[PDB]
């Protein structure tokens, strides 16, 4: 059954998609030998989320769901995993990940069309449970980066567009998780309450959509789930890992009118702790990282629906080239792996790093 009550990760198996599998098999594996090559084939079988970072990625979502329908007709019990990620003036506090739509060029109307396209796909594939992460680095930017003109000027559009996404994708086979930053972003004491207030306000404003299950944390970041020692870059914070973060924010959501909110947490690049970060705010292509806890609904935690791999390891965070378009200074930092291609492009040396440092190990 595609429909569900409670945890949408229970009773299904997340599908490992062909897009990442193709990247690994055709961009990574030909450069690897022996033990590394075998291990890499195994990484491609770990389910990670497919990012709908352009409208012309929607045909690939459809293909993925088509593959799943076939597998499920043949005895499979698989679920699709996708990231909705195409807001106008996207990624407003950074320069690396600017998208195809802008508010000044009819971006809100274009975003609504993009959402409409996704809704039609989800309607077609009502037979497949569909797990969605909604708009990484959008709402979190509204909590801490209204001092960035691009974010301030986007605030109204973000809220309109996110409302449209969560209402229009509010369907019986869907579970949505709003992106909610991470321990080192919104876990800071002064950021917790405003963050919770914003998430609960989005939820209430959308008429409390039943398909809106909760929040996604650590997306495209590196924090440990439940590491027992605070890394040096966490500066003595109470909230120094994702478990502490969700247990801090969870009750605050309930306080602000969002009860029964649950979480998923990206561990795709969290295997090696501490990481190579020299400042907690360093997010771009972080050195000394590894593949982390494998996706599982067996979390041993009251609030965590599932460990997930949202950001696909190997896919770049942003270019390190000062002369290239979409260059962000964060990607040139001592703790950012050099030289890096455009955001989303394959970054072979980074994949190798993740594989070498994987915990649990693939080798
Ligand atoms: C010292 C101190 C004190 C205090 O009180 O508060 C703070 C708060 C701090 O927070 C820091 O805030 C910054 C923002 O100012 C955060 O930076 C943001 O980090 C996120 C990751 O956590 C970055 O996300 C990137 O962009 C997107 C995902 O949204 C990804 O790009 C896409 O990847 C897809 C899959 O491969 C592709 O399909 C797509 O084509 C591609 O574009 C990218 O990989 C991801 O890295 C965001 O850009 C960035 O602004 C920081 O995390 C947080 O710690 C710090 C210190 C405090
Ligand atoms: C509430 O929803 C409306 C559309 O019904 C939208 O324009 C607005 O941005 C939302 N406000 C908040 C605070 O989420
Ligand atoms: C952390 O979580 C993992 C996965 O659930 C578990 O195996 C491990 O025992 C946990 N460690 C601690 C200290 O809670
Ligand atoms: C969705 O609806 C189906 C109806 O077949 C139920 O079996 C399931 O429990 C879920 O609520
Ligand atoms: C998801 O589907 C897989 C295979 O279809 C199972 O191994 C798992 O138990 C879950 O039903
Ligand atoms: C599978 O898909 C990947 C990602 O689009 C390509 O890099 C590869 O060539 C193959 O077509
Ligand atoms: C790409 O294809 C290879 C085989 O060519 C697999 O081993 C890998 O898992 C991925 O699907
Ligand atoms: C990765 O992509 C290539 C095409 O560039 C395929 O031939 C290969 O089998 C894998 O899917
Ligand atoms: C895989 O990586 C090697 C370097 O290890 C390259 O030479 C090759 O082109 C592919 O990117
Ligand atoms: C890694 O190990 C596998 C065994 O599963 C071999 O098939 C391959 O040649 C590689 O060395």
From Swiss-Prot:
UniProt-listed Enzyme Commission number(s): 3.2.1.91
PTM remark: Asn-226 contains mainly a high-mannose-type glycan (Hex(7-9)GlcNAc(2)) in a 3:1 ration with a single GlcNAc. Asn-205 was primarily unglycosylated with a small fraction (18%) bearing a single GlcNAc at this site.
Positions annotated as active site in the UniProt record: 137
Source organism superkingdom: Eukaryota
Activity vs pH: Optimum pH is 4-6.
Signal found in the keyword field: yes
Keywords of this entry: Carbohydrate metabolism, Cellulose degradation, Disulfide bond, Glycoprotein, Glycosidase, Hydrolase, Polysaccharide degradation, Pyrrolidone carboxylic acid, Secreted, Signal
Reaction equation(s) it catalyzes: Hydrolysis of (1->4)-beta-D-glucosidic linkages in cellulose and cellotetraose, releasing cellobiose from the non-reducing ends of the chains
Outcome of substituting residue 91 to A: 20% of wild-type activity
Class of enzymatic activity (EC top level): hydrolase
S-S bonds: 92-151, 284-331
Main location: secreted
A GO BP entry: cellulose catabolic process
A GO cellular-component term linked to this record: extracellular region
Family designation: Belongs to the glycosyl hydrolase 6 (cellulase B) family.
Comment block on domains: The enzyme consists of two functional domains, a catalytic core joined to a carbohydrate-binding domain (CBM) by a serine-, threonine-, and proline-rich, highly glycosylated linker sequence.
Protein name: Exoglucanase 2
Encoding gene, per UniProt annotation: cbh2
Part of the whole protein covered: 109 to 471 of 471
């Amino acid at each position: 059954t595609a429909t569900y009550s409670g945890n949408p990760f229970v009773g299904v198996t997340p599908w490992a998609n062909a897009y990442y599998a193709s990247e690994v098999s055709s961009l990574a594996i030909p450069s690897l030998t022996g033990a590394m090559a075998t291990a890499a084939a195994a990484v491609a079988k770990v389910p990670s989320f497919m990012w709908l970072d352009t409208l012309d990625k929607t045909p690939l979502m459809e293909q993925t769901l088509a593959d799943i329908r076939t597998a499920n007709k043949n005895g499979g019990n698989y679920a699709g995993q996708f990231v909705v990620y195409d807001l106008p003036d996207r990624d407003c506090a950074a320069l690396a990940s600017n998208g195809e739509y802008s508010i000044a060029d009819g971006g809100v109307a274009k975003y609504k069309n993009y959402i409409d396209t996704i809704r039609q796909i989800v309607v077609e594939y009502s037979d497949i449970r569909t797990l969605l992460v909604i708009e990484p680095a959008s709402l979190a930017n509204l909590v801490t980066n209204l001092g960035t003109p691009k974010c301030a000027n986007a605030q109204s559009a973000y809220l309109e567009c996110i409302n449209y996404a969560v209402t229009q994708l509010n369907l019986p086979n869907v579970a949505m998780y709003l992106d909610a930053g991470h321990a080192g972003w919104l876990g800071w004491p002064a950021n917790q309450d405003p963050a919770a207030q914003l998430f609960a306000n989005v939820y209430k404003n959308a008429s409390s959509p039943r398909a809106l299950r909760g929040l996604a944390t650590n997306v495209a970041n590196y924090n440990g789930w439940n590491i027992t020692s605070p890394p040096s870059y966490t500066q003595g914070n109470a909230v120094y890992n994702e478990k502490l973060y969700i247990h801090a924010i969870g009750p605050l959501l309930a306080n602000h009118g969002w009860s029964n909110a649950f979480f998923i947490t990206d561990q795709g690049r969290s295997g090696k702790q501490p990481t190579g970060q020299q400042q907690w705010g360093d997010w771009c292509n972080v050195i000394g990282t590894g593949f982390g806890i494998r996706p599982s609904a067996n979390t041993g935690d009251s609030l965590l629906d599932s460990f997930v791999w949202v950001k696909p390891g190997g896919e770049c965070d942003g270019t390190s080239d000062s002369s290239a378009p979409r260059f962000d200074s964060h990607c040139a930092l001592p703790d950012a792996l050099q030289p890096a291609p455009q955001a989303g492009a394959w970054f072979q040396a980074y994949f190798v790093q993740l594989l070498t440092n994987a915990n649990p190990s693939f080798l």
